[PDB]
From a paper:
Thymidylate synthase (TS, EC 2.1.1.45) plays a pivotal role in human cells, since it catalyzes the reductive methylation of 2′-deoxyuridine-5′-monophosphate (dUMP) to 2′-deoxythymidyne-5′-monophosphate (dTMP), using N5,N10-methylenetetrahydrofolate (mTHF) as cofactor. In human cells, TS provides the only synthetic source of dTMP necessary for DNA biosynthesis, indeed its inhibition halts the replication processes and induces apoptosis in rapidly dividing cells, an effect known as “thymineless death”. Former structural studies have revealed that the hTS homodimers are able to switch between two alternate conformations, named active and inactive, primarily by changing the orientation of the loop including the catalytic Cys195 (catalytic loop, residues 181–197). Human thymidylate synthase works as an obligate dimer, showing a stable quaternary assembly due to an extended inter-subunit interface.
The hTS variant Q62R, having the interface residue Gln62 replaced by arginine, was generated and characterized through kinetic assay, circular dichroism (CD) thermal denaturation analysis and X-ray crystallography. The structure of HT-hTS Q62R was solved to 2.55 Å resolution, showing that the mutated protein retains the constitutive dimeric quaternary structure of the wild-type enzyme. Four enzyme homodimers (A–B, C–D, E–F, G–H, in our model) were found in the cell asymmetric unit (ASU), all fully traced apart for the first twenty-five N-terminal residues (further the twelve residues belonging to the non-removable His6-tag). From the initial phases of structure solution and refinement, it was evident that HT-hTS Q62R was in the active conformation. Nonetheless, the analysis of the electron density in the active site area evidenced that the catalytic Cys195 was modified as S,S-(2-hydroxyethyl)thiocysteine (CME195) by the reaction with β-mercaptoethanol, added to the protein sample prior to the crystallization experiments. In all subunits, a sulfate anion was observed nearby the catalytic cysteine, anchored to the guanidinium moieties of the four arginine residues Arg50, Arg215, Arg175′, and Arg176’ (the last two from the partner subunit). Furthermore, in all active sites, the presence of a folate-like molecule was systematically observed. The active conformation adopted in the crystal by HT-hTS Q62R can be ascribed to the population of the cofactor site by 5-FTHF (the formation of the analogous complex in the wild-type enzyme has never been reported). However, the comparison of the mutant crystal structure with that of the wild-type enzyme in the active conformation suggests a likely explanation for the observed HT-hTS Q62R destabilization occurring in solution. The superimposition, displayed in Figure 6, provides clear evidence that the point-mutation Q62R induces a slight aperture of the enzyme dimer which is particularly visible in the area surrounding Arg62 and Arg62′ on the two enzyme halves.
Author numbering:
A (entry chain A): 26 to 313
B (entry chain B): 25 to 313
The structure:
């Protein structure tokens, strides 16, 4: 087979050549296309992109915090991972009109929705225990008890909650599906920062599928990535033109280091990325 | 060449017949299934109503107008001559899900409810929901009118809080609009596709919805992109589909809107005309209740 990384590089090239120029909320400007699809195998490989060093600590800390149910950027920041920080700052918060919120309180984003869909948000500090729908645990429970079920969904798109989010979910909705003894996942990504977010988001969902496969006794299958609004910010064009000239090296493997029973017990130290040989880091700026 | 138009649907069928996995399902029918497919249907001077069989267009049109009104009552649809929801609202079905105290035809907070009242507290199918919840459809329209650059133009029917009250959770789960070159496109995330019966309706339906929104926003329809999660043929569809896969698609019909409409709720059935529709004969297929 060809390297799966070529799909992503394919997507980049496609946007650079035929994407429309639009204005955007962030002021940066973008090139954008609508409606793309890639399929990354998870069978004895893991799609951490190799044409640039991806911040793997970032992906892994990020997801654990999602699982944790946290909406507090500083709880992520404590770990070495400054990715959510700008969306959670005094400045940004004030520019959305959220003058009462504390520094780092992103609103009812991913963690809250994955774990407590439907609950009344208050602040990142509240104890939301027992409240809302625990979509994640229900996914796991469905995979174990009725793997043939056609409703195995986790949705972060909460239209009621939209007005309180520092930012509405880019990765809006996933579906898992079991065939033979393999667990697959399809992500519907309504909005894809192709330069910065998407490398993270791909690894993020591949890693989630690995975790759920581990605790359900399934083997991981495919991660299918459906994009809606896929954009390159203009300050990413030159950076990605550098990236486009690199040859993918073989994807690494993800190793899980102990039998873990419940999604909540996973710790950063339970994972090891083996045989990851990326090209150098390419600094790209985050559009705020 | 890679397939285009109806050929995508036909090839989707062939792939499930030759490739899908045999599973038992909630209906007891059995299915063949496959996970994660995609098709792109042009809406430019063509309307994707399948020609390899006669699709019940009035069904499609009457089902979408019912969605838009925000009805959750099978009988309001049934009374228009369109029976496709009756089985999912019958006494027996409702009871089998434990809804004994609920009136026949009360589907719960399904599609129409979520589009125009997302997050409101569902009472019964009879309640006035005038001005409660999030009106997603109206929000779609207005953001298209005023900020086409917005990468958050989304109508989502998937409501985890409301699932336990639904006759059936949404098969067409979420949709997103996109605007380029004064053209309106729409991607649909269909978590569950009944490939022989519902999927022909769904395509026609999203394409319909896109024509109406294009029409009220001063845009021209572009593309309908169809993303399938779980895609499945019911076993007792297999022989009927074998007739269908024998036939050559004919060119798609055109859809004409008959008058200048300003508001979404203003559309009536009389406003649409399908022109040059030329299907091979209806192929009947039993529904999986
Ligand atoms: N513009 C934008 N904002 C967003 C997202 C996004 O994808 N794009 N997100 C949705 O995903 C969240 C943030 N995700 C992010 C993922 C990676 C990086 C980033 O700066 N990547 C660098 C830095 C790595 C490091 O910190 O050492 C890199 O990989 O080069 C930033 C945000 C919320 N806000
Ligand atoms: N099994 C099943 N249940 C479902 C759906 C579905 O697609 N399949 N739906 C999600 O979409 C909803 C109803 N949609 C339907 C659309 C068409 C037909 C059907 O029987 N089609 C016949 C109609 C013929 C006629 O009425 O004249 C046909 O097209 O031959 C049934 C349900 C609710 N539950
Ligand atoms: Cl609650
Ligand atoms: Cl480096
Ligand atoms: Cl012919």
């Amino acid at each position: 087979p060809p390297h799966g990384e070529l799909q992503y590089l394919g997507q980049i090239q496609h946007i650079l050549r035929c994407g429309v120029r639009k204005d955007d909320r962030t002021g940066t400007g973008t090139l954008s296309v609508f409606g793309m699809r890639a399929r990354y195998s998870l069978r004895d490989e893991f799609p951490l992109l190799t044409t640039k060093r991806v911040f793997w600590k970032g992906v892994l800390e990020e997801l654990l915090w999602f699982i944790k149910g946290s909406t507090n950027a500083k709880e992520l920041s404590s770990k070495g991972v400054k990715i959510w920080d700008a969306n959670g700052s005094r400045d940004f918060l004030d520019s959305l009109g959220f003058s009462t919120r504390e520094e780092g309180d992103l609103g009812p984003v991913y963690g809250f929705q994955w774990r407590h869909f439907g609950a009344e948000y208050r602040d990142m500090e509240s104890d939301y225990s027992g409240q809302g729908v625990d979509q994640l645990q229900r996914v796991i429970d469905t995979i174990k008890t009725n793997p043939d079920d056609r409703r195995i969904i986790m949705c972060a798109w909460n239209p009621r909650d939209l007005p309180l989010m520092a930012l509405p979910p880019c990765h809006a909705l996933c579906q898992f599906y079991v065939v033979n003894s393999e667990l697959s996942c399809q992500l519907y990504q309504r909005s894809g920062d192709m330069g910065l977010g998407v490398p993270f988001n791909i690894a993020s969902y591949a890693l989630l599928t690995y975790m759920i496969a581990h605790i359900t006794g399934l083997k991981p299958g495919d991660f299918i990535h459906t994009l809606g609004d896929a954009h390159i910010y203009l300050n990413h064009i030159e950076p990605l033109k550098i990236q486009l000239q690199r040859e993918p090296r073989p994807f690494p493997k993800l190793r899980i280091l102990r039998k873990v029973e419940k999604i909540d017990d996973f710790k950063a130290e339970d994972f090891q990325i083996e045989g990851y040989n990326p090209h150098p880091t390419i600094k790209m700026e985050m559009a705020v």
